[PDB]
């Protein structure tokens, strides 16, 4: 699934990430444009040999079990193919956690690059929120 930009606010929204640790709906929106360009079905792989899924590229290294990232953690208990569902939830779960570690929302390369310190707000103008 791609999802509309307002459709995944209003997902996003539904399942409590707007304001999630401190940070903003837009800030989420804008996260999920530059690490899938809002599709449910992106793979990334990496260097070390992990990969990512999904609208929040979430890696197989420490959060999802995908069978083929050797020494890997799987601290969202969910396998790596759940991140890719039409159905935001195993993410919008997932990514609660990665963003309550040490590091908050730095934990997206796309995020710290694309979107920290932007007007983020824009990614949720127009939108029936
Ligand atoms: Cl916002
Ligand atoms: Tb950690």
Same mark, same amino acid.
């Given at each position: %699934?791609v999802f509309?930009? &307002?459709?995944?606010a $209003?997902?996003? %929204?539904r399942?409590?990430?707007?304001?999630?640790?401190?940070?903003?709906?837009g800030?989420?929106?804008?996260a999920?444009?530059?690490?899938?360009?809002?599709? /449910?079905? $992106?793979?990334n792989? +990496?260097?070390?040999?992990?990969?990512?899924y999904?609208?929040?590229?979430i +890696?197989?290294?420490?959060? &999802? #079990?995908?069978? *083929? /990232? !050797?020494?890997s953690?799987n601290?969202?208990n969910? !396998? &790596?193919?759940?991140l890719?569902?039409?159905?935001i /939830?195993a993410?919008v #779960?997932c990514? %609660? %956690?990665?963003?309550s570690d040490?590091?908050?929302?730095?934990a997206?390369?796309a995020?710290? +690059?694309?979107?920290?310190?932007?007007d983020?707000? $824009?990614w949720? *103008?127009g &939108?029936r929120?």
């Amino acid at each position: %699934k791609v999802f509309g930009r &307002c459709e995944l606010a $209003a997902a996003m %929204k539904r399942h409590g990430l707007d304001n999630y640790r401190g940070y903003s709906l837009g800030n989420w929106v804008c996260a999920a444009k530059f690490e899938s360009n809002f599709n /449910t079905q $992106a793979t990334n792989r +990496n260097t070390d040999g992990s990969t990512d899924y999904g609208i929040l590229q979430i +890696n197989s290294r420490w959060w &999802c #079990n995908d069978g *083929r /990232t !050797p020494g890997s953690r799987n601290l969202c208990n969910i !396998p &790596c193919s759940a991140l890719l569902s039409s159905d935001i /939830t195993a993410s919008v #779960n997932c990514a %609660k %956690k990665i963003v309550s570690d040490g590091n908050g929302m730095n934990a997206w390369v796309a995020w710290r +690059n694309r979107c920290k310190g932007t007007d983020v707000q $824009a990614w949720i *103008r127009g &939108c029936r929120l």
